[PDB]
Amino acid sequence: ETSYTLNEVVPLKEFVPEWVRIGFSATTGAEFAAHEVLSWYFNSELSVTS
Amino acid sequence: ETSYTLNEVVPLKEFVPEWVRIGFSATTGAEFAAHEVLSWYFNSELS
Amino acid sequence: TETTSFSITKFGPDQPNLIFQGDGYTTKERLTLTKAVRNTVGRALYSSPIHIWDSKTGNVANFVTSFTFVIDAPNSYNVADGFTFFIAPVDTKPQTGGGYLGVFNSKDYDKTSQTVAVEFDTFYNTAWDPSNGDRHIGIDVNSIKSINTKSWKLQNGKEANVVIAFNGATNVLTVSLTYPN
Amino acid sequence: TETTSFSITKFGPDQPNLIFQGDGYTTKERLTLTKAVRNTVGRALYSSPIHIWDSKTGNVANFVTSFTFVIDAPNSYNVADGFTFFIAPVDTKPQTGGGYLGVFNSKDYDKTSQTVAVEFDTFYNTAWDPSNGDRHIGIDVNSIKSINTKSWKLQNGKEANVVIAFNGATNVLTVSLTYPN
Ligand SMILES: *[C@@H]1O[C@H](CO[C@@H]2O[C@@H](C)[C@@H](O)[C@@H](O)[C@@H]2O)[C@@H](O[C@@H]2O[C@H](CO)[C@@H](O[C@@H]3O[C@H](CO[C@H]4O[C@H](CO)[C@@H](O)[C@H](O)[C@@H]4O[C@@H]4O[C@H](CO)[C@@H](O)[C@H](O)[C@H]4NC(C)=O)[C@@H](O)[C@H](O[C@H]4O[C@H](CO)[C@@H](O)[C@H](O)[C@@H]4O[C@@H]4O[C@H](CO)[C@@H](O[C@@H]5O[C@H](CO)[C@H](O)[C@H](O)[C@H]5O)[C@H](O[C@@H]5O[C@@H](C)[C@@H](O)[C@@H](O)[C@@H]5O)[C@H]4NC(C)=O)[C@@H]3O)[C@H](O)[C@H]2NC(C)=O)[C@H](O)[C@H]1NC(C)=O
Ligand SMILES: *[C@@H]1O[C@H](CO[C@@H]2O[C@@H](C)[C@@H](O)[C@@H](O)[C@@H]2O)[C@@H](O[C@@H]2O[C@H](CO)[C@@H](O[C@@H]3O[C@H](CO[C@H]4O[C@H](CO)[C@@H](O)[C@H](O)[C@@H]4O)[C@@H](O)[C@H](O[C@H]4O[C@H](CO)[C@@H](O)[C@H](O)[C@@H]4O[C@@H]4O[C@H](CO)[C@@H](O[C@@H]5O[C@H](CO[C@]6(C(=O)O)C[C@H](O)[C@@H](NC(C)=O)[C@H]([C@H](O)[C@H](O)CO)O6)[C@H](O)[C@H](O)[C@H]5O)[C@H](O)[C@H]4NC(C)=O)[C@@H]3O)[C@H](O)[C@H]2NC(C)=O)[C@H](O)[C@H]1NC(C)=O
Ligand SMILES: [Ca+2]
Ligand SMILES: [Ca+2]
Ligand SMILES: [Mn+2]
Ligand SMILES: [Mn+2]
Secondary structure (H helix, E strand, C coil), X not given: CEEEEEXXXXXHHHCCCXXXXXXXXXXXXXXCCEEEEEEXXXXXXXXXXX | CEEEEEEXXXXXXXXXXXXXXXXXEEECCCCCCEXXXXXXXXXXXXX | CEEEEEEEXXXXXXXCCEEEEECCXXXXXXXXXXXXXCCCEEEEEECCCEECECCCCCCECEEEEEEEEEEECCCCCCCCCEEEEEEEECCCCCCCXXXXXXXXXXXXXXXXXXXXXXXXXXXXXXXXXXXXXXCEEEEEECCCCCCEEEECCCCCCCCEEEEEEECCCCCEEEEEEEECC | CEEEEEEECCCCCCCCCEEEEECCEEECCEEEEECCCCCCEEEEEECCCEECECCCCCCXXXXXXXXXXXXXXXXXXXXXXXXXXXXXXXXXXXCCCHHHCCCCCCCCCCCCCCCEEEEEECCCCCCCCCCCCCCEEEEXXXXXXXXXXXXXXXXCCCEEEEEEEECCCCCEEEEEEEECC
């Protein structure tokens, strides 16, 4: 039982291209653990007029 | 104001695979015309 | 639970979320499947595979698509060949052109097709189109000889708002073409 | 309004929505990025590209992603290295593994990286992680050093629900993880 929240003002347009791919990434090194995603939902909406 | 409707019964199960790819198509032959689309919306809700 | 959706108002020069086949491309906010050119077949499928039905439960998906296509014809006396919205296997590739709308082969029920397809046929093909000729909406399943038809009066140069839903339960496919004017 | 959505709640052997990179695979109905093995990198991407912003308007998208994840370590003391949700260019390939989470190649600001990522880092890397040495949720952008972090108590084997949202107007990314029970 515990919850964490974080948020930073990130101006996405100047770091990422108009078109982008999204997804998950996980790694291991000298030490390790198993990472698994049990579910995934995503919704993006973008207006098209200045 | 002019509509056309047609709703037939068709079991997709018996015909298309579980994973399909949807899209548009158009052709010509001896006769022709320009077939172009302007907007496209889609939504699947499978439980 | 397993949803998939997308809305595209304008198609840019580069349309990443689409896979173009045949002579299909884009030009000025719109998607162009064919030009007013003899013999051509241009298709455009959405890039990500869709989960239509689950075997484990037998549930089918409910879905609704909507769009605004348009047929540009110089002379309204010799229009061809049509337009389609198909549901085909992931690895779908363009098939026979012309009267087959680039989706089917032969007028017989070939199981290999696995592609249902609603169409807006704008040209009379004897061995598979309604005897009275007449352009028409038409549902298909593994063949070009429509499973049912509805005469349609082509309104050249005029865009047409179409909606197409499916009830995975009652398995009823409702095609719907309306001219905004 | 350009839009893209999908829900997945049962990954399968043949789960075509995704793109698997590295040692990523879909087993036990769950998306498996890595297992309890050394030096591996498992990434999975949604097949369809998404339009995050537009040039001829300057409009930026508005989005939300919700996912449940599980980091199961054999030993709760020695855990490494981290999970991550990322936004990268259309043709991303796995980058440096290990402490670099597979999405970055260095600590310096790599302008050409074009990758922003919300990381859940379970291993202290003295070279660039927060001095306190706590597991943390961090927001990276063009480098493995987070521009902001929040200490987080990893619950070995328990599933946390994460909710990340982005407001195109105020441009504030929001991330929330919650361990029910
Ligand atoms: C009990 O607990 C102990 C304590 O645990 C610690 O404390 C707890 C409280 C908790 O916080 C724990 O989380 C925490 O770990 C355990 O002891 C600790 O164990 C750690 C695991 O090994 C260990 O950390 C590791 O350190 C090495 C680096 O050590 C050397 O280098 C340091 C600089 O980085 C330097 O400062 C050190 O001094 C040291 O240098 C010398 O090393 C000699 C031999 O070790 C030693 O004799 C010398 O004395 C020493 N020099 C001096 C002056 O003393 C580091 O490499 C590890 O990092 C990798 O994993 C972490 C995540 O786990 C990643 O963040 C990181 O990116 C690394 O990831 C990849 O690891 C791969 C291997 O797993 C690399 O590969 C190699 O491939 C070749 C190919 O043939 C070969 O197979 C090698 O064997 C592989 O290693 C991989 O390579 C690099 O990346 C790739 C992509 C290429 O770019 C390649 O070119 C690169 O080289 C690498 N990738 C990357 C990107 O780095 C890790 O941090 C702790 O130091 C240790 N002790 C302490 C006090 O913490 C104890 O083990 C536990 N016991 C049990 C039974 O469980
Ligand atoms: C004024 O108006 C008049 C009248 O218009 C009509 O009436 C008005 C009122 C209105 O209703 C209009 O809509 C009406 O059109 C107009 O005159 C009429 O014009 C029509 C158009 O030219 C003519 O019809 C054509 O007829 C030809 C020949 O006869 C057909 O019918 C036979 C009996 O059914 C049949 O057996 C024949 O095989 C043939 O089909 C026909 O070829 C035309 O069909 C093509 O076009 C239509 C529409 O675009 C399309 O639906 C068809 O599918 C077909 O499309 C493709 O067209 C291209 C380009 O021509 C073809 O390319 C050639 O292909 C070959 C090789 O292909 C074959 C092969 O050998 O392998 C050919 C084989 O026959 C075929 N076999 C079978 C069983 O299909 C095979 C097979 O499919 C293989 O599997 C192929 O994969 O393919 C070479 O490569 C050549 O180099 C290449 O050029 C494609 O083959 C073809 N694709 C396919 C899949 O078929 C069309 O039906 C009317 O007859 C004509 N006369 C009258 C009195 O109406 C007049 O011109 C107007 N004038 C003015 C000034 O405006
Ligand atoms: Ca026809
Ligand atoms: Ca780390
Ligand atoms: Mn027909
Ligand atoms: Mn970090």
